[PDB]
Design a protein around this ligand. Structure first.
Ligand SMILES: *[C@@H]1O[C@H](CO)[C@@H](O)[C@H](O)[C@H]1NC(C)=O
Ligand SMILES: *[C@@H]1O[C@H](CO)[C@@H](O)[C@H](O)[C@H]1NC(C)=O
Ligand SMILES: *[C@@H]1O[C@H](CO)[C@@H](O)[C@H](O)[C@H]1NC(C)=O
Lengths: 225, 224, 225
């Protein structure tokens, strides 16, 4: 059983708490017995969009269930039961939302593209260094003046551990744009989503005009004499 | 039956859809049978707390329960169904989300405090301008340097209709600060929770240098 | 009695205290009569704008009576009495101005539209911040170039208590106006009226040049290649 617990990126972006307990490595039969036993053993929901008959012969039993967020946030033990026709012993895989992980907020710093890249005028990459967040996954999204960009245009990195600070994680997210859009001043907002911020979501903004320092410090001294 | 629909500010502030049921004009009867129900009348979620004496000079209760998010987000109705001897029948005063309204995203414009206020130096008021949102609800908070302020620090006006667009609404949020906090240069962030936003919250920030020009720092240093 | 006291917005805009009454929730059914007391028993005058028979308060009538401006302040007790099969004798719905309130001078600011609104170029919102007052419905009226603007263009907030003040309250008044109208000068002025004001009116003006510095006129011009 290739059971996939719901990460934050699936839940926040969809707004839907969907859990999967997809069974694999067995030819597709009528032996679907996944029932989504709760902490009390109660059933939840049927599944509709089953898997395919792959060359690897994956079972067509996805175990999709629109489980309540107010049920999943308590983090109680969920055990998958697969009472196979040949094997009456269920394939017990326990899963729960881990609690006690130290809630540290991300420090989203949005870094504008380097001048060595803007000199080429062919492709510009804008990166948000979501950094310092300890509780595992983050969902990074890119919006442009309220319009979210396509997920084929930005790629976020996987959360790797922090170099110096122990127990933290960082995650990059680049946005390959063209320098005409960057040079016209189109505001790009990297927005992240993590369950450790005070409002669980923060945004950062970058423009061409963001990086410019005060280059002309005019000092109009008058009435000296 | 004055069962309160779960207002969006309450379900966003606590991250829990609380549907309450404050039966107004109650008697001195503590035997009120508040049996909650939906249109799918099974697995009903009862109340967990009992209210106390109210301005009606009698004894009343509340029907606060925890429901799921996507039932009300879909539009699943709920009924308190106050079964009492004073009512002739249990009143079916249902509460739900009647859909059929547009979803206009608010655009918040952080207005810095006026120069006439900053000269008086006793206070400063930063007014968030939440405007152009078609559901009426916004949940506005203020966060200073990443930490949210007290609810007594800010006041959010009730959303009133926009002049030009009748479907859209506007709202205000004033954060009253001391003037020396503003001339320190601390960033005050306005977070607005309204449902039509893509991430369901927008943050804009303000500081004393956000009205200053980015390029030229033209000073005017006097001399003798 | 559904009596509406004329608040100070009415007695300031119409310059006449109009003693709005109704027979709502009265047992009188048809051919009602209106009686008013100036605390000496002589206040009533039957006016026009009489509403008609609707299932709540059949054969209704207003009790509008033009008593002067000083009297409402001087505290004449005002009752709307109907002599019929409803209660003729009790007239304990007596309403006048409260005798002692903490009168606080509305120290008013004109906050110019934010630069994001002018960058959107659709509309510009000018907020008349009124803070520090007994809530006599400061009549925050907006005039552009002397002439009054329409009541539709400006929306005034209902007064709400100030957060860091015990007995002071705040209000807001947004004049939604076009971005091109704001850029071309066009001073929009704001009068806020209240009892606590020394002349019952203070006014403030705003323009594109209000926040601009006055001794230096620093411009920035690109000769872009
Ligand atoms: C800018 O000019 C002002 C003149 O008042 C001076 O005090 C300040 O040090 C200058 N800053 C820089 C970075 O040159
Ligand atoms: C900008 O000008 C102000 C004027 O007093 C000065 O205090 C400040 O140090 C200047 N900053 C820079 C970076 O020059
Ligand atoms: C500087 O002055 C000219 C005319 O004297 C005016 O057109 C221009 O708008 C001024 N600059 C700014 C930034 O207002």
């Amino acid at each position: 059983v290739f059971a996939i617990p719901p990460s934050f990126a699936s839940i926040f972006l969809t707004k839907s708490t969907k859990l999967t307990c997809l069974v694999t490595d067995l030819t597709t039969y009528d032996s679907v017995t996944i029932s989504w036993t709760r902490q009390n053993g109660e059933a939840v929901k049927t599944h509709t969009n089953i898997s395919e008959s792959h060359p690897n012969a994956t079972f067509s039993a996805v175990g999709e269930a629109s489980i309540c967020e107010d049920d999943w946030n308590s983090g109680e033990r969920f055990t998958c039961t697969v009472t196979h026709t040949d094997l009456p012993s269920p394939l017990k895989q326990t899963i729960s939302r881990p609690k006690g992980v130290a809630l540290h907020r991300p420090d989203v710093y949005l870094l504008p593209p380097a001048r060595e890249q803007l000199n080429l005028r062919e492709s510009a990459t804008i990166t948000c260094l979501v950094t310092g967040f300890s509780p595992a996954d983050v969902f990074v999204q890119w919006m442009q003046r309220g319009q979210p960009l396509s997920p084929e245009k930005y790629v976020t990195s996987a959360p790797m551990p922090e170099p110096q600070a122990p127990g933290r994680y960082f995650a990059h997210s680049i946005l390959t744009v063209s320098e005409e859009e960057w040079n016209t001043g189109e505001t790009y907002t990297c927005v992240v989503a993590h369950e450790a911020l005070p409002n669980r979501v923060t945004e950062r903004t970058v423009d061409k005009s963001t990086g410019k320092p005060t280059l002309y410090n005019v000092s109009l001294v008058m009435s000296d004499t």
